[PDB]
Write a protein that binds this ligand. Sequence first.
Ligand code: HEC
Ligand code: HEC
Lengths: 129, 129
Amino acid sequence: SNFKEADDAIHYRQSAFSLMAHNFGDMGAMLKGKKPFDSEIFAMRAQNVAALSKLPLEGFIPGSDQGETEALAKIWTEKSDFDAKMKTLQDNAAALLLASASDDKKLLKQSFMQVAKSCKGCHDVYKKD
Amino acid sequence: SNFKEADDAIHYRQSAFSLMAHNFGDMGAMLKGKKPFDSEIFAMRAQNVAALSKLPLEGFIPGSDQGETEALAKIWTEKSDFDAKMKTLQDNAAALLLASASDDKKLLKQSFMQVAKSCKGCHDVYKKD
Ligand code: HEC
Ligand code: HEC
């Protein structure tokens, strides 16, 4: 295994998701007008989200559904669909990174919403209530 | 500020460092023979370390030296030198990513050691004992 104990795998994936959320939420705040929009900071965030999105799958090792985690056990009996949702997150984050190189606000919002749908769609099925 | 409270900034930088350490340590384990060396996994790790190294500086916001943190207060009275160490970490991680595209083991070890010196050199000065 890549981790000494199961708790290390849980902490790893949780930390990657938390960092993803900070960067993704800053993009959302800018698009929603909650803070000033800045195209360079937006692109920096999109790069961070794309890089961070490659990290958490590693942490979903067998046997790491016990203890202090919000990951449902059915992740590991439906692992093919789970992995496919994670892969789609990657593609969507790559599209948002590409969109961040342009200044078309509607295309930015559209690409952002596709990533957001990836986050929520996986959570609704595979994260504890 | 990019963070709602100081504890959020602390958690952010701590999480980025923790993820960096997992990826960096896997490269070290492979170079030291503690686990089988794999050039593709090594390159994946080098990319992750380079991406993650761009994240933690954001978290060192003014006033976030109180509470549950190992960051010393002198980070903020010596912030120029601190930032310069972080920038050098970036350059070193970029060099290790470039080295990971080749199969020269001595050059890989040399580039890895330069990053490791960045980690320890900053810790020795700016992280609590
Ligand atoms: C499945 C394919 C997921 C996708 C895509 C995204 N997330 Fe998620 N997330 C998932 C799980 C199974 C869990 C629980 C992990 C655990 O071990 O507890 C999470 C958790 C989070 C969290 C909380 C992290 C923590 O501090 O404990 C956050 C903030 C989070 N996820 C955010 C997030 C965002 C912003 C996403 C899209 C950009 C996203 N996740 C995708 C499963 C999946
Ligand atoms: C200064 C310029 C640093 C460089 C370069 C690196 N690190 Fe570091 N690290 C630094 C500080 C000030 C702190 C304390 C942060 C806090 O708020 O507590 C840390 C902390 C860590 C940790 C512990 C994280 C945690 O879970 O709390 C780790 C595992 C860590 N740092 C690893 C690490 C590695 C592997 C580095 C090089 C690749 C590296 N850091 C560079 C300051 C600095």
